[PDB]
């Protein structure tokens, strides 16, 4: 499904992303916006046999298993299909594990380029959450 900006922010707050390991809620809402326009079904094929899945475009090369990606590590120990659900539970759990590595949110290029070091709070501003 395609989340509304505030709707996703509230769901993300509920799923404990606000201040998770120091990342305020804005960072996540912003990353989602630039990664998939808040679309849980977003999909993207890469030059290699990997595909990015979900609202946070998580890669099947390192994070999830789709059963047809060469060199799959499945770090999140989850089927990639679980990252396309309207229920963001899986995408958030995996995102939390990704950001728990040394390079935090720098795992999401879109975040660095279009969110890192900006007034990220502006993304949840206006939302009654």
């Amino acid at each position, epitope marked *: 499904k395609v989340f509304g900006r505030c709707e996703l922010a509230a769901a993300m*707050k*509920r*799923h*404990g*992303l*606000d*201040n*998770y*390991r*120091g990342y305020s809620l804005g960072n996540w809402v912003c990353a989602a916006k630039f990664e998939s326009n808040f679309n849980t079904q977003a999909t993207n094929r890469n030059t290699d046999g990997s595909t990015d899945y979900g609202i946070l475009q998580i890669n099947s090369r*390192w994070w999830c298993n789709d059963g047809r990606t060469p060199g799959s*590590r*499945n*770090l999140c*120990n989850i089927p990639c299909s679980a990252l396309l659900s309207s229920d963001i*539970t899986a995408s958030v*759990n995996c995102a*939390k*594990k990704i950001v*728990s*590595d*040394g*390079n935090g949110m720098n795992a999401w290029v879109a975040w660095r380029n279009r969110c890192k070091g900006t007034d990220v709070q502006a993304w949840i501003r206006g939302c009654r959450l």
Partner: antibody
Framework: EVQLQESGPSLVKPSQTLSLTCSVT????????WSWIRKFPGNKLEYMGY???????YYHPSLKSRISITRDTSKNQYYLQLNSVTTEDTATYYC???????WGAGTTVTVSS | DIVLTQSPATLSVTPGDSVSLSCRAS??????LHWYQQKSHESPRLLIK???QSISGIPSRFSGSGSGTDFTLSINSVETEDFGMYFC?????????FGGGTKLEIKR
């Protein structure tokens, strides 16, 4: 199924170094984050630290400096080194996946001269 | 460091009774609270992750609730194999920390 097993000296002398090995079977040590957790005699638990995919480590500050966590991809194991121990480092040590879904049986290390 | 306080320190029940174990955090941790069971002579076992998410393979009598700083682990109809220690652990901020634990013991 993934399985973990700790091993190493059960006795370390004060001021010396404590070393433990965690053998990973079932999956690659490069395909998950790995941690070390210790349970003191009183039964309290302390999350010592973990090593993630990039090789980056996070160490507990109330310990930090003395601890080092490393891994060996060819042997599919990861390790724990804790320098300058004192009797207070006596505890049951466990290796576990970052997710907490898998734990070793644990191994007791006693610090005594 | 985030401090987690569990209560009661100990609880004596009769198999068949239901129980609720509390864990409170010194700072809000949203839903980043996990529950472990640890029997004597055994390693910890993850029962609930992220405050309320069920773990496939864990008995349905175990459930968790709460958010922010107030959490609860419920066991509806405690069974004879459920006695032991129960700890909560937060993963919201480093260093990860554990509560002091609650001991579930048999009533007689």
């Amino acid at each position: 199924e993934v399985q973990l097993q700790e091993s190493g000296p059960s006795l370390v002398k004060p001021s010396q170094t404590l070393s433990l090995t965690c053998s990973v079977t079932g999956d690659s040590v490069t395909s998950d984050y790995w941690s070390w957790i210790r349970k003191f005699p009183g039964n309290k638990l302390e999350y010592m630290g973990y090593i993630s995919y990039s090789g980056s480590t996070y160490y507990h500050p109330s310990l930090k400096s003395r601890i080092s966590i490393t891994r060996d991809t060819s042997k599919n194991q990861y390790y724990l080194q804790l320098n300058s121990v004192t009797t207070e480092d006596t505890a049951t040590y466990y290796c576990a996946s970052w997710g907490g879904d898998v734990w070793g049986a644990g191994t007791t290390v006693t610090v005594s001269s | 460091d985030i401090v987690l306080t569990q209560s009661p320190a100990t609880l004596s029940v009769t198999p068949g009774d239901s129980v609720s174990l509390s864990c409170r955090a010194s700072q809000s941790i949203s839903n980043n609270l996990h529950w472990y069971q640890q029997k004597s002579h055994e390693s910890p076992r993850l029962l609930i992750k992220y405050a309320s998410q069920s773990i496939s393979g864990i008995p349905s009598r175990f459930s968790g609730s709460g958010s922010g700083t107030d959490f609860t682990l419920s066991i509806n109809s405690v069974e004879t194999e459920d006695f032991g220690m129960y700890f909560c652990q937060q993963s919201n901020s480093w260093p990860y920390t554990f509560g002091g634990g609650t001991k579930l013991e048999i009533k007689r």
